Every structure is written in structure tokens, then in C-alpha cells.
PDB file of C-alpha atoms in Angstrom:
ATOM      1  CA  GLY A   3       0.885 -21.029 -34.240  1.00  0.00           C
ATOM      2  CA  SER A   4       3.056 -21.806 -36.011  1.00  0.00           C
ATOM      3  CA  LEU A   5       3.707 -18.099 -36.669  1.00  0.00           C
ATOM      4  CA  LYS A   6       1.985 -16.464 -33.718  1.00  0.00           C
ATOM      5  CA  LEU A   7       3.697 -13.936 -31.446  1.00  0.00           C
ATOM      6  CA  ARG A   8       6.414 -15.240 -29.128  1.00  0.00           C
ATOM      7  CA  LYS A   9       6.594 -14.006 -25.528  1.00  0.00           C
ATOM      8  CA  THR A  10       9.858 -12.839 -23.971  1.00  0.00           C
ATOM      9  CA  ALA A  11      11.346 -15.013 -21.218  1.00  0.00           C
ATOM     10  CA  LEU A  12      10.494 -12.289 -18.678  1.00  0.00           C
ATOM     11  CA  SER A  13       6.884 -12.086 -19.903  1.00  0.00           C
ATOM     12  CA  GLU A  14       6.577 -15.858 -19.472  1.00  0.00           C
ATOM     13  CA  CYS A  15       7.829 -15.500 -15.863  1.00  0.00           C
ATOM     14  CA  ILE A  16       5.365 -12.656 -15.229  1.00  0.00           C
ATOM     15  CA  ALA A  17       2.553 -14.918 -16.452  1.00  0.00           C
ATOM     16  CA  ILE A  18       3.700 -17.620 -14.013  1.00  0.00           C
ATOM     17  CA  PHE A  19       3.757 -15.024 -11.215  1.00  0.00           C
ATOM     18  CA  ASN A  20       0.271 -13.748 -11.986  1.00  0.00           C
ATOM     19  CA  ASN A  21      -1.032 -17.324 -11.922  1.00  0.00           C
ATOM     20  CA  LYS A  22       0.771 -18.343  -8.722  1.00  0.00           C
ATOM     21  CA  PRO A  23       3.252 -15.915  -7.156  1.00  0.00           C
ATOM     22  CA  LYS A  24       5.152 -18.434  -4.996  1.00  0.00           C
ATOM     23  CA  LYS A  25       5.736 -20.676  -8.047  1.00  0.00           C
ATOM     24  CA  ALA A  26       7.422 -17.814  -9.941  1.00  0.00           C
ATOM     25  CA  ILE A  27      10.143 -17.142  -7.358  1.00  0.00           C
ATOM     26  CA  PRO A  28      12.146 -20.355  -7.931  1.00  0.00           C
ATOM     27  CA  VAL A  29      11.609 -19.941 -11.716  1.00  0.00           C
ATOM     28  CA  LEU A  30      12.798 -16.310 -11.746  1.00  0.00           C
ATOM     29  CA  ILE A  31      16.011 -17.350  -9.940  1.00  0.00           C
ATOM     30  CA  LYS A  32      16.524 -20.384 -12.234  1.00  0.00           C
ATOM     31  CA  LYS A  33      16.240 -18.078 -15.258  1.00  0.00           C
ATOM     32  CA  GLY A  34      18.410 -15.324 -13.728  1.00  0.00           C
ATOM     33  CA  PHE A  35      15.750 -12.614 -13.366  1.00  0.00           C
ATOM     34  CA  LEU A  36      15.953 -12.795  -9.566  1.00  0.00           C
ATOM     35  CA  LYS A  37      19.195 -12.855  -7.551  1.00  0.00           C
ATOM     36  CA  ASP A  38      17.831 -14.983  -4.711  1.00  0.00           C
ATOM     37  CA  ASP A  39      14.699 -15.477  -2.583  1.00  0.00           C
ATOM     38  CA  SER A  40      15.636 -12.923   0.103  1.00  0.00           C
ATOM     39  CA  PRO A  41      12.830 -10.527   1.098  1.00  0.00           C
ATOM     40  CA  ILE A  42      14.679  -7.508  -0.300  1.00  0.00           C
ATOM     41  CA  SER A  43      15.431  -9.169  -3.663  1.00  0.00           C
ATOM     42  CA  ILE A  44      11.810 -10.209  -4.104  1.00  0.00           C
ATOM     43  CA  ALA A  45      10.409  -6.838  -2.929  1.00  0.00           C
ATOM     44  CA  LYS A  46      12.634  -4.950  -5.373  1.00  0.00           C
ATOM     45  CA  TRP A  47      11.539  -7.200  -8.258  1.00  0.00           C
ATOM     46  CA  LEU A  48       7.853  -6.603  -7.411  1.00  0.00           C
ATOM     47  CA  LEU A  49       8.380  -2.817  -7.551  1.00  0.00           C
ATOM     48  CA  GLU A  50      10.688  -2.691 -10.591  1.00  0.00           C
ATOM     49  CA  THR A  51       8.773  -5.068 -12.876  1.00  0.00           C
ATOM     50  CA  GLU A  52       5.961  -3.822 -15.128  1.00  0.00           C
ATOM     51  CA  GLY A  53       2.990  -6.046 -15.924  1.00  0.00           C
ATOM     52  CA  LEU A  54       2.432  -7.687 -12.545  1.00  0.00           C
ATOM     53  CA  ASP A  55      -1.212  -8.059 -11.579  1.00  0.00           C
ATOM     54  CA  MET A  56      -1.772  -5.731  -8.618  1.00  0.00           C
ATOM     55  CA  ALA A  57      -4.238  -8.124  -7.023  1.00  0.00           C
ATOM     56  CA  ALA A  58      -1.805 -11.019  -7.354  1.00  0.00           C
ATOM     57  CA  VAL A  59       0.929  -8.840  -5.798  1.00  0.00           C
ATOM     58  CA  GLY A  60      -1.319  -7.711  -2.941  1.00  0.00           C
ATOM     59  CA  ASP A  61      -2.472 -11.237  -2.183  1.00  0.00           C
ATOM     60  CA  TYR A  62       1.154 -12.460  -2.227  1.00  0.00           C
ATOM     61  CA  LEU A  63       2.312  -9.699   0.126  1.00  0.00           C
ATOM     62  CA  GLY A  64      -0.744 -10.296   2.309  1.00  0.00           C
ATOM     63  CA  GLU A  65      -0.274 -14.039   2.917  1.00  0.00           C
ATOM     64  CA  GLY A  66      -0.400 -15.023   6.599  1.00  0.00           C
ATOM     65  CA  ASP A  67       3.006 -16.713   6.487  1.00  0.00           C
ATOM     66  CA  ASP A  68       6.088 -15.212   8.133  1.00  0.00           C
ATOM     67  CA  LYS A  69       8.160 -15.280   4.899  1.00  0.00           C
ATOM     68  CA  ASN A  70       5.493 -13.322   3.009  1.00  0.00           C
ATOM     69  CA  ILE A  71       5.224 -10.906   5.929  1.00  0.00           C
ATOM     70  CA  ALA A  72       9.001 -10.368   5.668  1.00  0.00           C
ATOM     71  CA  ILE A  73       8.702  -9.684   1.916  1.00  0.00           C
ATOM     72  CA  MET A  74       5.881  -7.219   2.592  1.00  0.00           C
ATOM     73  CA  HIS A  75       7.998  -5.415   5.187  1.00  0.00           C
ATOM     74  CA  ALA A  76      10.837  -5.172   2.649  1.00  0.00           C
ATOM     75  CA  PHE A  77       8.348  -3.922   0.041  1.00  0.00           C
ATOM     76  CA  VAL A  78       7.252  -1.045   2.308  1.00  0.00           C
ATOM     77  CA  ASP A  79      10.928  -0.379   3.152  1.00  0.00           C
ATOM     78  CA  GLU A  80      11.630   0.390  -0.539  1.00  0.00           C
ATOM     79  CA  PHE A  81       9.327   3.424  -0.460  1.00  0.00           C
ATOM     80  CA  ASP A  82      10.699   6.885   0.192  1.00  0.00           C
ATOM     81  CA  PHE A  83       8.000   8.871   2.005  1.00  0.00           C
ATOM     82  CA  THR A  84      10.435  11.554   3.201  1.00  0.00           C
ATOM     83  CA  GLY A  85       8.803  15.012   3.021  1.00  0.00           C
ATOM     84  CA  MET A  86       5.467  13.747   1.650  1.00  0.00           C
ATOM     85  CA  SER A  87       2.099  14.464   3.208  1.00  0.00           C
ATOM     86  CA  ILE A  88       0.517  11.333   4.653  1.00  0.00           C
ATOM     87  CA  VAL A  89      -1.960  11.488   1.731  1.00  0.00           C
ATOM     88  CA  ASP A  90       0.797  11.582  -0.897  1.00  0.00           C
ATOM     89  CA  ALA A  91       2.554   8.704   0.863  1.00  0.00           C
ATOM     90  CA  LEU A  92      -0.679   6.698   1.034  1.00  0.00           C
ATOM     91  CA  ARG A  93      -1.398   7.393  -2.659  1.00  0.00           C
ATOM     92  CA  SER A  94       2.060   6.184  -3.688  1.00  0.00           C
ATOM     93  CA  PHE A  95       1.722   3.091  -1.504  1.00  0.00           C
ATOM     94  CA  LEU A  96      -1.865   1.994  -2.233  1.00  0.00           C
ATOM     95  CA  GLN A  97      -1.589   2.517  -5.999  1.00  0.00           C
ATOM     96  CA  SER A  98       1.242  -0.094  -6.083  1.00  0.00           C
ATOM     97  CA  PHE A  99      -0.837  -3.163  -5.062  1.00  0.00           C
ATOM     98  CA  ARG A 100      -4.415  -4.163  -4.190  1.00  0.00           C
ATOM     99  CA  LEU A 101      -5.151  -4.509  -0.481  1.00  0.00           C
ATOM    100  CA  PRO A 102      -6.442  -7.998   0.415  1.00  0.00           C
ATOM    101  CA  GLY A 103      -9.880  -8.561   1.848  1.00  0.00           C
ATOM    102  CA  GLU A 104      -9.428  -9.690   5.426  1.00  0.00           C
ATOM    103  CA  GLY A 105      -8.941  -7.062   8.065  1.00  0.00           C
ATOM    104  CA  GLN A 106      -6.007  -8.706   9.813  1.00  0.00           C
ATOM    105  CA  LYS A 107      -4.012  -8.625   6.562  1.00  0.00           C
ATOM    106  CA  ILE A 108      -4.914  -5.006   5.888  1.00  0.00           C
ATOM    107  CA  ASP A 109      -3.807  -4.125   9.417  1.00  0.00           C
ATOM    108  CA  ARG A 110      -0.343  -5.616   8.735  1.00  0.00           C
ATOM    109  CA  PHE A 111       0.093  -3.407   5.639  1.00  0.00           C
ATOM    110  CA  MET A 112      -1.196  -0.260   7.309  1.00  0.00           C
ATOM    111  CA  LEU A 113       0.850  -0.677  10.493  1.00  0.00           C
ATOM    112  CA  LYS A 114       4.050  -1.119   8.478  1.00  0.00           C
ATOM    113  CA  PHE A 115       3.102   1.851   6.286  1.00  0.00           C
ATOM    114  CA  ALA A 116       2.528   3.966   9.412  1.00  0.00           C
ATOM    115  CA  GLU A 117       5.851   2.912  10.922  1.00  0.00           C
ATOM    116  CA  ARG A 118       7.743   3.746   7.716  1.00  0.00           C
ATOM    117  CA  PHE A 119       5.951   7.061   7.331  1.00  0.00           C
ATOM    118  CA  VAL A 120       6.792   8.206  10.859  1.00  0.00           C
ATOM    119  CA  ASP A 121      10.390   6.922  10.607  1.00  0.00           C
ATOM    120  CA  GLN A 122      10.979   9.066   7.537  1.00  0.00           C
ATOM    121  CA  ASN A 123       8.990  12.060   8.760  1.00  0.00           C
ATOM    122  CA  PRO A 124      10.016  12.605  12.372  1.00  0.00           C
ATOM    123  CA  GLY A 125       8.018  15.267  14.197  1.00  0.00           C
ATOM    124  CA  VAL A 126       4.874  15.070  12.035  1.00  0.00           C
ATOM    125  CA  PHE A 127       3.244  12.675  14.489  1.00  0.00           C
ATOM    126  CA  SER A 128       4.581  11.649  17.891  1.00  0.00           C
ATOM    127  CA  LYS A 129       3.246   8.085  17.491  1.00  0.00           C
ATOM    128  CA  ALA A 130       2.875   5.636  14.611  1.00  0.00           C
ATOM    129  CA  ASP A 131      -0.600   4.774  15.982  1.00  0.00           C
ATOM    130  CA  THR A 132      -1.744   8.252  14.903  1.00  0.00           C
ATOM    131  CA  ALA A 133      -0.587   7.669  11.320  1.00  0.00           C
ATOM    132  CA  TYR A 134      -2.074   4.151  11.440  1.00  0.00           C
ATOM    133  CA  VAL A 135      -5.602   5.213  12.404  1.00  0.00           C
ATOM    134  CA  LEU A 136      -5.511   8.308  10.204  1.00  0.00           C
ATOM    135  CA  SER A 137      -4.694   6.104   7.205  1.00  0.00           C
ATOM    136  CA  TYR A 138      -7.974   4.179   7.611  1.00  0.00           C
ATOM    137  CA  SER A 139      -9.921   7.418   7.889  1.00  0.00           C
ATOM    138  CA  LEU A 140      -8.248   8.653   4.703  1.00  0.00           C
ATOM    139  CA  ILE A 141      -9.062   5.417   2.850  1.00  0.00           C
ATOM    140  CA  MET A 142     -12.709   5.733   3.924  1.00  0.00           C
ATOM    141  CA  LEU A 143     -12.837   9.398   2.915  1.00  0.00           C
ATOM    142  CA  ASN A 144     -11.360   8.494  -0.462  1.00  0.00           C
ATOM    143  CA  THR A 145     -14.039   5.861  -1.015  1.00  0.00           C
ATOM    144  CA  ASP A 146     -16.925   8.076   0.141  1.00  0.00           C
ATOM    145  CA  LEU A 147     -15.835  11.039  -1.991  1.00  0.00           C
ATOM    146  CA  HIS A 148     -14.978   9.134  -5.189  1.00  0.00           C
ATOM    147  CA  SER A 149     -16.224   5.511  -5.253  1.00  0.00           C
ATOM    148  CA  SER A 150     -19.183   4.777  -2.999  1.00  0.00           C
ATOM    149  CA  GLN A 151     -22.536   3.880  -4.531  1.00  0.00           C
ATOM    150  CA  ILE A 152     -24.240   3.274  -1.154  1.00  0.00           C
ATOM    151  CA  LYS A 153     -23.135   6.249   0.985  1.00  0.00           C
ATOM    152  CA  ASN A 154     -23.375   9.997   0.481  1.00  0.00           C
ATOM    153  CA  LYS A 155     -20.180  12.031   0.226  1.00  0.00           C
ATOM    154  CA  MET A 156     -18.459  12.456   3.584  1.00  0.00           C
ATOM    155  CA  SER A 157     -18.393  16.081   4.743  1.00  0.00           C
ATOM    156  CA  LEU A 158     -15.306  17.749   6.136  1.00  0.00           C
ATOM    157  CA  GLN A 159     -17.123  18.024   9.481  1.00  0.00           C
ATOM    158  CA  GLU A 160     -17.620  14.242   9.550  1.00  0.00           C
ATOM    159  CA  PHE A 161     -13.961  13.651   8.650  1.00  0.00           C
ATOM    160  CA  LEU A 162     -12.906  15.864  11.593  1.00  0.00           C
ATOM    161  CA  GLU A 163     -15.228  13.942  13.924  1.00  0.00           C
ATOM    162  CA  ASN A 164     -13.868  10.583  12.758  1.00  0.00           C
ATOM    163  CA  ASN A 165     -10.361  11.585  13.874  1.00  0.00           C
ATOM    164  CA  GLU A 166     -11.168  13.042  17.291  1.00  0.00           C
ATOM    165  CA  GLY A 167      -8.498  12.277  19.880  1.00  0.00           C
ATOM    166  CA  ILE A 168      -6.060  10.439  17.603  1.00  0.00           C
ATOM    167  CA  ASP A 169      -2.970  12.553  18.385  1.00  0.00           C
ATOM    168  CA  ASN A 170      -1.937  10.829  21.622  1.00  0.00           C
ATOM    169  CA  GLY A 171      -5.404  11.469  23.092  1.00  0.00           C
ATOM    170  CA  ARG A 172      -5.840  14.964  21.651  1.00  0.00           C
ATOM    171  CA  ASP A 173      -7.424  16.250  18.449  1.00  0.00           C
ATOM    172  CA  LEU A 174      -5.201  17.117  15.503  1.00  0.00           C
ATOM    173  CA  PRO A 175      -5.398  20.744  14.363  1.00  0.00           C
ATOM    174  CA  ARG A 176      -8.474  21.432  12.223  1.00  0.00           C
ATOM    175  CA  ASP A 177      -6.348  23.151   9.569  1.00  0.00           C
ATOM    176  CA  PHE A 178      -4.094  20.084   9.263  1.00  0.00           C
ATOM    177  CA  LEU A 179      -7.022  17.719   8.737  1.00  0.00           C
ATOM    178  CA  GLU A 180      -8.754  20.138   6.338  1.00  0.00           C
ATOM    179  CA  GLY A 181      -5.569  20.119   4.237  1.00  0.00           C
ATOM    180  CA  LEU A 182      -5.585  16.336   3.995  1.00  0.00           C
ATOM    181  CA  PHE A 183      -9.319  16.309   3.223  1.00  0.00           C
ATOM    182  CA  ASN A 184      -8.730  18.631   0.269  1.00  0.00           C
ATOM    183  CA  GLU A 185      -5.783  16.558  -0.980  1.00  0.00           C
ATOM    184  CA  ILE A 186      -8.066  13.515  -1.151  1.00  0.00           C
ATOM    185  CA  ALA A 187     -11.013  15.489  -2.565  1.00  0.00           C
ATOM    186  CA  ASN A 188      -8.915  16.943  -5.397  1.00  0.00           C
ATOM    187  CA  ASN A 189      -7.038  13.763  -6.382  1.00  0.00           C
ATOM    188  CA  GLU A 190      -8.570  10.314  -5.778  1.00  0.00           C
ATOM    189  CA  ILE A 191      -6.292   7.513  -4.591  1.00  0.00           C
TER     190      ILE A 191
END
């Protein structure tokens, strides 16, 4: 300093979180920014607070510990997917944190997402498993249309093929899948 910028108390706590998420929880409560360490309290703070590192958040929610799993479930429970297409729901969800690397962690996120989506949109799909597998196909499509340096763009035909049989052992309607394809094509997640 001695006259350099001072950080707010909240900004100091956010810095602690971004360095080590679990260390911030007992500090946020101590300082009154967090009511308690219940899954719902923590999940709400993650979603309400600006300036959190999305990779730090994703890694925290993705930890293979039952308490972190509970927080992640609460995090998904805060989303309102009612009336959204599965693409709009996925966009809202995946733009709020960075998915971790290991497949088993990803699967936890995507299964809970699928369950929440079907709970709030009864009659779109008969089974959460349909929304679950479709979500991976949509993530792959998103990558191949907008991000990939090592694959050509995925065609609509290929996207249809990739989802054969997923509706309780039957194909989804072509028009339904074409709609989702275009949603992804026109606005990257």
C-alpha cells in the first residue's frame, strides 16, 4: 500500500472460496454472509453471488463426498426448468458452472439435471433416462458445431442417428430432434 484499493469483506470471502471452496464455508458463516452449512444455504449462495470462479464452483459441486453431492443436488433444485426446451434448460444449467473432468462426476450432474427437468416438465419424456442420454448428445453436438478443432461439424443426420431408440426403446420424432439441433446450432451453449 499504504494507499492501494481495499477489498470488501465479501470480495475477500470470494477470494477464499476461489482458492479453496470448503475453507470459505466456515468463514462465510463466521462473517455472516452464509446462514449455515446446509446444502440449500450453500447452493443458494453459489447461485446468488457474482464473482465466483466457475471452475472452482464446478469442482466443489463435483467432489466425490456425500456432503458435496447433497450441495450439488440442492444447486440443481434451485433451477426452474418449467416450460423450457431441454436445450434451454441445459444452457441455463451448464453456463452456471464448469463440468469436472471425470466421467463419474459428470454423470452425477447430468442425472440430477435430467431428473429435475422431467419433474418440472411432465409428459415431455416418459423417463429421466431419455433426458439423461439426450443431454450428452446435445453437449457433443454443441462442441462439434461450435468448438471442435479435431472433428468436422456434426450433421443433423448424424445427430438423429446418435439418439436412435432413446425414448423407452423407440426413436424420438425427427421433427422434435431437428428442433433441438437448430436451437444448438443457432445459439452455442
